[PDB]
Symmetry: D2
Subunit: 216 residues, 4 copies
């Protein structure tokens, strides 16, 4: 299974896939079974906006992302989600602590290392308060509300190539938060590995973002 590590404790793991570039070719021509002619069709469908044949290629991912990242991701309605229940599921209680390198470019009054320290400080205080409430008898659903937005969560993502290509135009772009951009780059990498023709054609004719045309 393809697994790309993202941020300090996160990942993107490919669980399953249905079809390849030819799944889109079969659907566009409508018949159940030439390499150059088939790849030429992929480029034709892409450059002319014939997006429906690409809905026949489906992916299942296992993502471990911080809640603030998952909140931006889960806004993509044309997909299937299954996340860990904060009310009942036994979470690992891992948190995203940005490295000082995340603050490179911004001029700060305090050192970037002090920002990293202040984030660690408040997640430890919040987590200790949570355990103290849990130990005292407060139900999980009430005690968990004190936990920060950088807390790690795990989910299953079933998405078709069409909706995956929309996620890439929006999330694999400089206007999206750096944290989600990283997760989208891993999604693009897994997509390129499984559908090389559809990915290449996408970057050539349909891709609206910027970071995928700059980063290898």
């Amino acid at each position: 299974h393809m697994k790309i590590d993202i941020l300090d404790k996160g990942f993107v793991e490919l669980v399953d896939v249905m079809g390849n570039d030819l799944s889109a070719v079969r659907a566009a021509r409508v018949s159940f079974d030439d390499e150059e002619r088939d790849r030429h069709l992929i480029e034709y469908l892409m450059k002319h906006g014939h997006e429906t044949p690409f809905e026949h290629i489906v992916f299942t991912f296992h993502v471990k992302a911080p809640i603030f990242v998952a909140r931006q991701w889960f806004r993509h309605r044309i997909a299937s989600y299954n996340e860990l229940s904060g009310r009942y599921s036994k979470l690992s209680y891992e948190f995203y602590i940005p490295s000082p390198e995340r603050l490179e470019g911004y001029k700060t009054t305090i050192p970037p290392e002090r920002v990293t320290e202040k984030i660690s400080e408040i997640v430890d205080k919040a987590y200790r308060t949570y355990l103290e409430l849990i130990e005292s008898g407060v139900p999980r659903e009430v005690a968990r509300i004190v936990l920060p937005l950088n807390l790690y969560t795990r989910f299953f993502w079933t998405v078709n190539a069409r909706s995956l290509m929309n996620f890439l135009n929006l999330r694999a772009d400089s206007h999206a938060q750096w944290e989600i951009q990283q997760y989208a780059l891993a999604i693009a990498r897994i997509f390129k590995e499984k559908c090389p023709w559809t990915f290449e054609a996408f970057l050539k004719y349909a891709y609206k973002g910027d970071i995928l045309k700059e980063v290898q």
Copy 2:
């Protein structure tokens, strides 16, 4: 490939599938095996209305059906479709001619065999008019409008188990037209073969229709 013939010239063919019953188990637990425990979870998710884990099992079918059946089918929006272009495809023109046995139960002034003959008569007249217009230079998109609603079409249907179970509840039921009931029975057969635990649980706790609890 599983292929079930429906009506006089139609079929339902399984193109591809992603996952099995365990795909729904993995998605519900949020983790990438105990037969009794896994089957007990499928039954728990089904009886308590936890339907989202079943969206992680996806199917691709190749269906050949009359346009009046396709019109009823394509009303199911939570799916992916790709049909033959009536405007450009050099399609095989075949029509659904109901057998006299289709009219069994209804009291008719003319014999059921005469109904079958009258349908064949008018489809031949309509098809001959179409070819005459096509030969005379009329574009396909205009000449085709004279063809009857029993004209066979071909399409590719990508649907997840949840939306497939909604289709079964509605189309594999006596209230739906006899022609689509037949197509839904073939869908249920391919679904049972690939996801036996999910199909058994669905019939036991969620299935709202009638014909699937009567027909084997």
Copy 3:
């Protein structure tokens, strides 16, 4: 109620609408927490930068009477709500779309365009008479109707938001789409322009991918 007649016997009628151009402004203004000129400037900004979600808050309900072959192309738009006349039970008017000889202008035909119109009328009369003969003899509606041509008129209700409506106009109000549905999309664009003038103007200026709306008034 706005009603635009399409083809020989069809129409597009506006049943209801929710919101206007300022509905999209109110929905966008919640993001960055906080005037006609300023609110029109926002619509144009959202449109040119691909911020499409605020436009989902403007919803329309239409009543369309179109030939089945047109409805088949329309109903492919899944991000909408539909409700059509039941062919199995509903009492249809039994009206058919007969193209005028002017529809065949441009194409070189061996037979005159007037003969094409006559041949279409000929076969719809034959099919309709066969249908009534089966209906009178006791054949159930669901079986007897299968002989009727694709040019037969149907009626439906269409509930669609401005975002999905703008996808429809992109695809159907374009030269690559069949002339029949282009006509229906032009009336949709007309009703959309009348209710959402700022959104429609911004749409043609920055987001519209088709061709006929930038040429036809």
Copy 4:
């Protein structure tokens, strides 16, 4: 219509399209007593598509943990407060001691309320300190707790709204979202009384509304 939820939250009706007859007009394509009888017929026989023609727009102010459960309902339109570009107001959900009634706790319920206020003040002060020192909003905000209030616009049709009520206006859903769901049901009852009544009588799967 505005219904206040929890300590600082609300559900406000922005706009609505149609009423009970919008579903009647949409169904009749396929008299008060005869129209109401149709509503009950469509509901008891599972004819749900005519109800998609009644659409609502709400303005909701709810904590992030409630919004996370709400936003899982994909058959709807959402528009939320950025966070990356918006000005973070000191608005967090502090449960009252009455929220812990029923559970036996080692510390008093009033001390739980105090400990929640204590940690939100610490997290909000840390946030302002990072913001003042030059840390961008999108990075500094990650320290804020899940009880932080957010605002969003919700455009949903009656069919998807009735699915939301079957799931969220039920004892199995968290008590906080149940409260919001009761406000969604109240506004729905006021605008579509026939649809709500028939829904309660034949289609409603939950428990708290009955």
